[PDB]
Design a protein around this nucleic acid. Structure first.
Ligand SMILES: [Ba+2]
Ligand SMILES: [Ba+2]
Length: 327
DNA sequence: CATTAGA
DNA sequence: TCTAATG
């Protein structure tokens, strides 16, 4: 957590590079496991050799460990950190819609900058277009104060179209957080569950609502169960307009809400931990359900959930408010 | 780890 | 269809 620090950090820096700038999936996977194991080790690594006894710790990385331990740096790392092409790739990637594959290609062509990208709006897809368009506001954080404002509206139209809707704004938002990155809307309806052959409109109806009123302003992607877009709070009585915010709405079988909700509400650790516990408590949890465990090794059969509570009751735990779902 | 765009 | 990109 701190004794192993430089090493892991360095390591992940090293991995992230192969992954992005190069296409060395394996090298990439190689740095990562090591970085993983060195991180668990209970002692201060004092040399490669020591490190090296590790699983996944080979000659190559051990050799990097010495250089780092000896000199407080690493040339490859300094060389990469310097590398304009490689810098370029890391950068283009911040554009929503630009993954690595694209980054390299863009660079290939000579498009390294933000402006480059402008000048070539044509070479970009609608996604990347919006990404581009809203590069600043995409990078900006979302004050809870706004999250509040946003959630308000959202619940308003939802209810508007059909009273029988259920919408939850999941994530750190959900967990109190002073600020969020984007807004997560988990959606469901009785008339939709496990078997009940869809009702894509269920999704459709709402997005359309949100738009109608101007909450939605763009579409990154719209499918029959997962809508992904851009929104904005009504810029008041002038002098102050609001930043473009990423939003995501998704349909869910009413029969799987709570788990999904539970699960999407996090935290990543609270989850892992509760989950670990349901294992002992003779269960299994996962984004959609909660099944009892059968001794044979495994088992099935989804216990019924009507609230975040049920899942709790099931593993006989303390209902934890989302506030303190921290870990 | 599943959903969507696109080519 | 596959393959990239999001989460
Ligand atoms: Ba070894
Ligand atoms: Ba990106």
């Amino acid at each position: 957590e701190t004794l192993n620090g430089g090493i892991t950090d360095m390591l992940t820096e090293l991995a992230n590079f192969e992954k992005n700038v190069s296409q060395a999936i394996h090298k990439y996977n190689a740095y990562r496991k090591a970085a993983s194991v060195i991180a668990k080790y209970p002692h201060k690594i004092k040399s490669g050799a020591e490190a090296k006894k590790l699983p996944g710790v080979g000659t190559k990385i051990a050799e990097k460990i010495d250089e780092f331990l000896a000199t407080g740096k690493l040339r490859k790392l300094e060389k990469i950190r310097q590398d304009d092409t490689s810098s370029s790739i890391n950068f283009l990637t911040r554009v929503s819609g630009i993954g690595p594959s694209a980054a390299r290609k863009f660079v290939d062509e000579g498009i390294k900058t933000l402006e480059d990208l402008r000048k070539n709006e044509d070479k970009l897809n609608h996604h990347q277009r919006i990404g581009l368009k809203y590069f600043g506001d995409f990078e900006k954080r979302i004050p809870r104060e706004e999250m509040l404002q946003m959630q308000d509206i959202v619940l308003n139209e939802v209810k508007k179209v059909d009273s029988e809707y259920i919408a939850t704004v999941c994530g750190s938002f959900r967990r109190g957080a002073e600020s969020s990155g984007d807004m997560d809307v988990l959606l469901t309806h009785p008339s939709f569950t496990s078997e009940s052959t869809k009702q894509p409109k269920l999704l459709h109806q709402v997005v359309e609502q949100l738009q109608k009123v101007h909450f939605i302003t763009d579409t990154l992607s719209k499918g029959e169960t997962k809508f992904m877009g851009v929104c904005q709070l009504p810029s008041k009585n002038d002098e102050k307009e609001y930043p473009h915010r990423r939003i995501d709405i998704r349909l869910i079988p009413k029969d799987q809400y709570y788990c999904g909700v539970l699960y999407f509400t996090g935290s990543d650790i609270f989850n892992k931990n509760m989950r670990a516990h349901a294992l002992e408590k003779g269960f299994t949890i996962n984004e959609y359900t909660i099944r009892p465990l059968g001794v044979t090794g495994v088992a099935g059969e989804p216990l019924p959930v009507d609230s975040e509570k049920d899942i709790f009751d099931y593993i006989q735990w303390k209902y934890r408010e989302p506030k303190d779902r921290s870990e």
